[PDB]
Paper text:
Members of the solute carrier 17 (SLC17) family catalyze the coupled transport of anions driven by a proton electrochemical gradient ΔμH+ (= Δψ − 2.3× (RT/F) × ΔpH, where R is the gas constant, T is temperature, and F is Faraday’s constant), with contributions from both electrical potential Δψ and proton gradient ΔpH (pHo/pHi). The [name] ([name]) gene lies within an operon devoted to the metabolism of D-galactonate, suggesting a role in transport of this acidic sugar.
Nonsubstrate gluconate improved the diffraction, and it as well as β-nonylglucoside (β-NG) were identified nonspecifically within the aqueous cavity of the structure. The structure was determined to a resolution of 2.9 × 3.8 × 3.8 Å by molecular replacement (MR) trials based on all available major facilitator superfamily (MFS) transporters in turn because the MFS typically each crystallize in different parts of the transport cycle. The asymmetric unit contains 2 almost identical, antiparallel monomers of [name], with 4 molecules of β-nonylglucoside (β-NG) between the 2 molecules of [name] and a root-mean-square deviation (rmsd) of 0.57 Å between their congruent 392 Cα atoms. The structure contains residues 27 through 443, lacking a 6–amino acid unstructured cytoplasmic loop (residues 235–242) between transmembrane (TM) domains 6 and 7. Although the main cavity of the inwardly oriented structure is sealed to the outside, the N-terminal lobe of [name] contains a tunnel that extends from the periplasmic surface near glutamate-180 (Glu180; TM5) to a membrane-embedded site at aspartate-46 (Asp46; TM1). On the other hand, residues phenylalanine-278 (Phe278), proline-279 (Pro279), and Thr297 reduce the tunnel diameter to 2.4 Å, about the diameter of a water molecule (2.75 Å), suggesting a dynamic mechanism to control access of H3O+ from the periplasm. Thus, Asp46 is most probably protonated (uncharged) in this structure. In the inward-facing conformation, TM4 is continuous, whereas TM10 has a kink.
Numbering used by the authors: 27 to 234, 243 to 443
Write the structure that this text describes.
C-alpha cells in the first residue's frame, strides 16, 4: 500500500496548482482597489496566466521528455511557487503580468507530467480511477482553501494570500524532491506491490512528415464541435477561477467574508458533477446503450445546465445566487469529461496531436472569457457577462448536439 501515497502527493500538487490559479481571484478586488487598475486592465491580469499556459505546453512536452518526470516536477513547483510568493510584493501592473505569466510557464507542463507518472505508478484498470481522483479532488481543495485565503485576505493584507500560497509551494517542492522517485527507485515499496504494477502495467523503471492533409482531417465537422465544446467548458471554469469572487463583491455587493463562504458550495458542486458524470458513463452503457450516446449525454446536458448562470443576474438573494452558481458549476463538472471521448474520434495516427489542439481550444476559452468579462464589467456591469457564458454554453451545447450526432472512429 505504497502505490496510492504517490497518487496522494500528485493530488496535493494538483490542488497547490489550482490554488495558485485562483489565489488571484481572491485578491482581485484589493489589487484592483490598491493599484487602481480598471476592470478591463484587470481582465488582462487574469489572462496573463492563460496565455503562456497554452503556449508553453508543446515546449513543456520537450523539456519533460529530455529532463524527466521527477526533476521536471520540482523545477515546476519551485518555479511557480517562487513566482507566486512574489505576487505578494508586486507593485504596479506590469509586475503582476510578468509573475502571472511566469507562473503560467512553470505550471503549464503540470498535467503531462502527471499522465507520465500515473502511467508508471498504477496499472491500466486503476488509471481511470487514478486521474479521476486528483482532477475531481482539485475542486475540493479550492472549496476549502478559497474561503481560507479570503479570510486571510480579510485578516491580513492581500499580499499574504500570495506569500502563503507561494511559501507553501516552495516547501512542497522540497518535499517532492526527497519522497518521490520512480516505483523501481522507491524504498519502502513492497516487492509484491511492485510486481503487481509491473505485471499489471506501467513503466516502473520510467518512460523511454507533418502534412497539411491532417489539418483537413483534424478540422472535422465532428471535431470542430469538440473544440467549440471544450472552448465553452473552459470559458465557464475560468470565470469561477477568476472573476467569481469579485463578482459577488462588486456587482452584488456581498461582503468578502460572506462571499468567501459562499464560494465553497459551487466548488463542491463541481466535485459532484465530475463524479456524477463518471457514474452516468458506466451506468448508461451498462443498461444497454451505445458508447457515443453514453458520453454525449452528460456533456450536452451539463452545458445546457450551465445556461442557468444567466439567472443569477435576475436576483439579489445570496442563497438563490449561491444555488444558481452551484448548479451551473455542477453542469460544467458534469460536462467536463471530453478528451477520453475525443481520443476515440481522431485517426489512430493523430491521437497525440488532437490533444494539443483540443486543449488549445480549451485553453483558448480561458484566454477569452477573462478579457470579455473585464471589458463587459468595466462598461455595463457584470450583467452582460453572465448572458455571454450562458450563450457560449448554449453554443457549446448546440455545437455538441448538432455537429456530433454520431462518432467517426
Ligand atoms: C524576468 C523573468 C525572466 C523569466 C525567467 C523564467 C525562466 C527561468 C529561466 O531559467 C531556466 O532557463 C531554461 C532555458 O533557458 C529553462 O528550460 C528552465 O525551465 C528555466 O528554469
Ligand atoms: C488551460 C487550462 C486547463 C484547464 C482545463 C479545463 C477544461 C477541462 C478539460 O476537460 C477535461 O476532460 C477530461 C477527459 O477525461 C476530464 O477527465 C476532465 O475532468 C476535464 O477537466
Ligand atoms: O485534461 C486536462 O485536465 C486539461 O484540460 C488538459 O487539456 C491540459 O491542458 C493538457 O492537455 C494536459 O494533457
Amino acid at each position: 500500500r505504497r502505490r496510492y501515497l504517490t497518487l496522494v502527493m500528485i493530488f496535493i500538487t494538483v490542488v497547490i496548482c489550482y490554488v495558485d490559479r485562483a489565489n488571484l481571484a481572491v485578491a482581485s478586488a484589493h489589487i484592483q482597489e490598491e493599484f487602481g487598475i480598471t476592470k478591463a486592465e484587470m481582465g488582462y491580469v487574469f489572462s496573463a496566466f492563460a496565455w503562456l499556459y497554452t503556449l508553453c505546453q508543446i515546449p513543456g512536452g520537450w523539456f519533460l521528455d529530455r529532463v524527466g518526470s521527477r526533476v521536471t516536477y520540482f523545477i515546476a513547483i519551485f518555479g511557480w511557487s517562487v513566482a507566486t510568493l512574489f505576487q505578494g510584493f508586486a507593485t504596479g501592473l506590469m509586475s503582476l503580468i510578468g509573475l502571472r505569466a511566469i507562473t503560467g510557464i512553470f505550471e503549464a507542463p503540470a498535467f503531462p507530467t502527471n499522465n507520465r507518472m500515473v502511467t508508471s505508478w498504477f496499472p491500466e484498470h486503476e488509471r481511470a480511477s487514478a486521474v479521476g481522483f486528483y482532477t475531481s479532488g482539485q475542486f475540493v481543495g479550492l472549496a476549502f482553501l478559497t474561503p481560507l485565503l479570503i479570510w486571510i485576505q480579510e485578516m491580513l493584507s492581500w499580499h499574504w494570500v500570495f506569500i502563503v500560497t507561494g511559501g507553501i509551494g516552495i516547501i512542497w517542492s522540497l518535499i517532492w524532491f526527497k519522497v518521490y522517485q520512480p516505483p523501481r527507485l522507491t524504498k519502502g515499496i513492497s516487492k509484491a506491490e511492485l510486481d503487481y504494477i509491473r505485471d499489471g502495467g506501467g513503466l516502473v523503471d520510467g518512460d523511454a512528415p507533418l502534412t497539411a492533409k491532417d489539418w483537413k482531417l483534424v478540422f472535422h465537422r465532428k471535431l470542430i464541435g469538440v473544440y467549440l465544446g471544450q472552448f465553452a467548458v473552459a470559458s465557464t471554469l475560468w470565470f469561477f477561477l477568476t472573476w467569481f469572487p469579485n463578482y459577488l463583491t462588486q456587482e452584488k455587493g456581498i461582503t468578502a467574508l460572506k462571499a468567501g463562504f459562499m464560494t465553497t458550495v459551487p466548488f463542491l458542486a463541481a466535485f459532484v458533477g465530475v463524479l456524477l458524470s463518471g457514474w452516468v458513463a458506466d451506468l448508461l452503457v451498462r443498461k444497454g446503450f451505445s458508447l457515443g450516446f453514453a458520453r454525449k449525454t452528460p456533456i450536452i446536458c451539463g452545458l445546457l445546465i450551465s445556461t442557468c448562470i444567466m439567472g443569477a443576474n435576475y436576483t439579489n438573494d445570496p442563497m438563490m445566487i449561491m444555488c444558481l452558481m452551484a448548479l451551473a458549476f455542477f453542469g460544467n463538472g458534469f460536462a467536463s469529461i471530453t478528451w477520453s471521448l475525443v481520443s476515440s474520434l481522431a485517426p489512430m495516427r493523430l491521437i497525440g496531436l488532437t490533444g494539443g489542439v483540443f486543449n488549445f481550444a480549451g485553453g483558448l476559452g480561458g484566454i477569452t472569457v477573462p478579457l470579455v468579462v473585464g471589458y463587459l464589467a468595466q462598461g455595463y456591469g457584470f450583467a452582460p457577462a453572465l448572458v455571454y457564458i450562458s450563450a457560449v454554453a448554449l453554443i457549446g451545447a448546440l455545437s455538441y448536439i448538432l455537429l456530433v450526432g454520431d462518432v467517426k472512429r
